[PDB]
Amino acid sequence: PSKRSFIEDLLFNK
């Protein structure tokens, strides 16, 4: 679970 993976979760569901 990379940092890029979660940041994409945060941006896409913000």
Partner: antibody, heavy 131, light 109 residues
Framework: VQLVQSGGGVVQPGESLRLSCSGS????????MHWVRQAPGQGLDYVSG????????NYGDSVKGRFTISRDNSKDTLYLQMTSLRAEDTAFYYC?????????????????????????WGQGTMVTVSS | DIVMTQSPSFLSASVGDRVTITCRAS??????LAWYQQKPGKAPHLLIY???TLQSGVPSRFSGSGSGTEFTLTISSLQPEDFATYYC??????????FGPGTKVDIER
């Protein structure tokens, strides 16, 4: 370094079409990838975007529920699956390399010599939907 | 989403003229704005990001300004390759982005 598009053509309304966008020269697995379409004589309109891992997707309201974006990182290729196509979907479709989210600061506070986003575009693909 | 407007839609200038293009955002986007150039038969290519920051390889004659709602793209002296259509792009909602309708610059006569 390029984005090479394949597919497209003339289809009847209600049929399905698949667009492919193959990348080379950049680390495909790092960047969000996007699809943009330009209707004849019109502006650029947002279609869909996919996260680097592929778990996250967003869509334009006009295509939601009808369009599906997908990526195969093992082949450095982006896909757009178009179903229940309408005449309004007639446009020239572009794939664009998006941002690696680790450099999100560059959008508001540039840190490097360049912005590593929206720097590579596909050649474009014509999609005409007509009976 | 955020609606971007551009005035004017069409613009005429001579080579060696100063061109200023305006972009307006329906809501505050801070400096989350980029500018693009599209020529017929080609994909748009990035000129400016973060409202005022020049993308690498882009000539110094292009400059951008503004924060919040109102934004400006300035070409200090139009060059023969500059005749084209210019779009602004809000990046505030990234990964979602929307473009302005565009300003087309043709040669004055």
């Amino acid at each position: 370094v390029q984005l090479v598009q394949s597919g497209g053509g003339v289809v009847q309304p209600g049929e399905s079409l698949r667009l492919s966008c193959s990348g080379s020269g950049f680390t495909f697995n790092n960047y969000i990838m996007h699809w943009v379409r330009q209707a004849p004589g019109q502006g650029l309109d947002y279609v869909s975007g996919i996260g680097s891992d592929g778990r996250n997707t967003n869509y334009g309201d006009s295509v939601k529920g009808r369009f599906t974006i997908s990526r195969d990182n093992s082949k450095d290729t982006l896909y757009l699956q178009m179903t229940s196509l309408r005449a309004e979907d007639t446009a020239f479709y572009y794939c664009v390399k998006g941002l690696d989210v680790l450099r999100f600061l560059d959008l508001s506070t540039p840190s490097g010599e360049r912005l590593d986003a929206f720097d590579i575009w596909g050649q474009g693909t014509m999609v005409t939907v007509s009976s | 989403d955020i609606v971007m407007t551009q005035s004017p839609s069409f613009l005429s200038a001579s080579v060696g003229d100063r061109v200023t293009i305006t972009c307006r955002a329906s809501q505050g986007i801070s400096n989350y704005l980029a500018w693009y150039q599209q020529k017929p038969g080609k994909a748009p290519h990035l000129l400016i990001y973060a409202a005022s920051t020049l993308q690498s390889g882009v000539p110094s004659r292009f400059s951008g300004s503004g924060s919040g709602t109102e934004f400006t793209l300035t070409i200090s002296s139009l060059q023969p390759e500059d005749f084209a259509t210019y779009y602004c792009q809000q990046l505030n909602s990234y990964p979602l982005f929307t473009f302005g309708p565009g300003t087309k610059v043709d040669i004055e006569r």
